[PDB]
Amino acid sequence: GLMQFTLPVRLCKEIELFHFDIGPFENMWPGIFVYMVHRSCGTSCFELEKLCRFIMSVKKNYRRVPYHNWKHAVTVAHCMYAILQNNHTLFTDLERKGLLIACLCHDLDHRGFSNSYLQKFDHPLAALYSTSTMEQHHFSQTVSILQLEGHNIFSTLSSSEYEQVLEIIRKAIIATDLALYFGNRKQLEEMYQTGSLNLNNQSHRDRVIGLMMTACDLCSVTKLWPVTKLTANDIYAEFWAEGDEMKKLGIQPIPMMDRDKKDEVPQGQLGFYNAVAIPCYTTLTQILPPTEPLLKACRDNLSQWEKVIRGEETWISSPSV
Ligand SMILES: Cn1cc(CNc2cc(OC[C@H]3C[C@@H]3c3ccccn3)nc3ccnn23)cn1
Numbered sequence: 001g002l003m004q005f006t007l008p009v010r011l012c013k014e015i016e017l018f019h020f021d022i023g024p025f026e027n028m029w030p031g032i033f034v035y036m037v038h039r040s041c042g043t044s045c046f047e048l049e050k051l052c053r054f055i056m057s058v059k060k061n062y063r064r065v066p067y068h069n070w071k072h073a074v075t076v077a078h079c080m081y082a083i084l085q086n087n088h089t090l091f092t093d094l095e096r097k098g099l100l101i102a103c104l105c106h107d108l109d110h111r112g113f114s115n116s117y118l119q120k121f122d123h124p125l126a127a128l129y130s131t132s133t134m135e136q137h138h139f140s141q142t143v144s145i146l147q148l149e150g151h152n153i154f155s156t157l158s159s160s161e162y163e164q165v166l167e168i169i170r171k172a173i174i175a176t177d178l179a180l181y182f183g184n185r186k187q188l189e190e191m192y193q194t195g196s197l198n199l200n201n202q203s204h205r206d207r208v209i210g211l212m213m214t215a216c217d218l219c220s221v222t223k224l225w226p227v228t229k230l231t232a233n234d235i236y237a238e239f240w241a242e243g244d245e246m247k248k249l250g251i252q253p254i255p256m257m258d259r260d261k262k263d264e265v266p267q268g269q270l271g272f273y274n275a276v277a278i279p280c281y282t283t284l285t286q287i288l289p290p291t292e293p294l295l296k297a298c299r300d301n302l303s304q305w306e307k308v309i310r311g312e313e314t315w316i317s318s319p320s321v
């Protein structure tokens with residue numbers, strides 16, 4: 001069915017924008033990924049049959065959790081697409097191929113639990129992966145799908161190329177562990193301000209790709225306010241379900257995972273934008289100046305959350321609950 005799809009003409013110009021919301025086009029999501037791949041590395045970068053099998057099996061391996069689901073994978077892949085389009089010659093053909101695939105696969109088989117939850121409650125995944133637990137699992141799941149019959153989209157590559165893509169993918173998925181972001185951004189800020197940042201330097205390149213992954217992972221803060229607000233509802237529905245699990249086990253969750261502490265969400269979002277999102281997009285803009293619309297949109301949403309705290313603004317936009 002995916003092989004048969006044709007993209008509506010109105011979306012041609014829309015899909016190119018950073019603030020584009022995929023939300024209203026659920027039936028078109030696999031096709032939108034195909035179109036993005038074709039615009040990023042050409043119609044003859046992957047065999048259509050293999051790509052469509054890959055996409056559909058990835059979709060199947062995303063659980064029906066409130067936030068880390070199929071919609072999130074495609075949202076993240078679209079932000080990466082827009083980043084790559086606006087800085088096309090900075091990245092190699094191999095990087096473009098790997099990063100779009102890494103974004104689509106970055107939360108594969110997510111169970112709706114944080115790494116701290118899995119580590120604290122001795123889940124088998126935490127026994128197997130000591131650090132970046134879920135992220136190591138997401139990469140493993142990606143490899144398994146590639147290893148399926150008719151799914152190896154990277155078969156036509158040389159081994160120095162295949163091992164190279166699988167490493168670009170591995171590093172990119174691990175980088176989505178938010179615990180790793182803080183040190184990565186601090187490092188890049190230092191390299192930029194001292195003028196030592198060199199994109200020809202592989203260590204430096206891996207760090208920039210890392211920041212790109214964080215920037216894509218949190219891109220809901222870069223959408224129009226009604227979209228940002230609606231995604232925040234999904235993010236907290238997932239945090240609150242994990243908090244509910246801790247409460248059944250007699251443990252008090254931190255306020256961000258406590259549904260009885262909803263009033264702390266606007267202050268919680270202000271803190272997150274100030275300590276996480278704003279520095280992320282600020283650093284990204286400095287390194288890749290065409291990414292400035294993400295920083296601009298993030299600042300607008302920071303102002304909206306400031307208005308919510310001040311009582312100047314109010315979930316879902318509906319006359320009835
Ligand atoms: C579900 N999930 C999402 C992610 C990462 N992405 C993410 C997390 C996040 O955490 C906000 C809570 C820390 C704030 C808080 C502190 C105290 C009280 C209330 N809130 N906010 C946002 C906005 C856009 N993306 N995003 C990781 N698992």
Ligand SMILES: [Mg+2]
Nearest residue numbers: 106107176177
């Ligand atoms: Mg993740």
Ligand SMILES: [Zn+2]
Nearest residue numbers: 106107176217
């Ligand atoms: Zn994610």
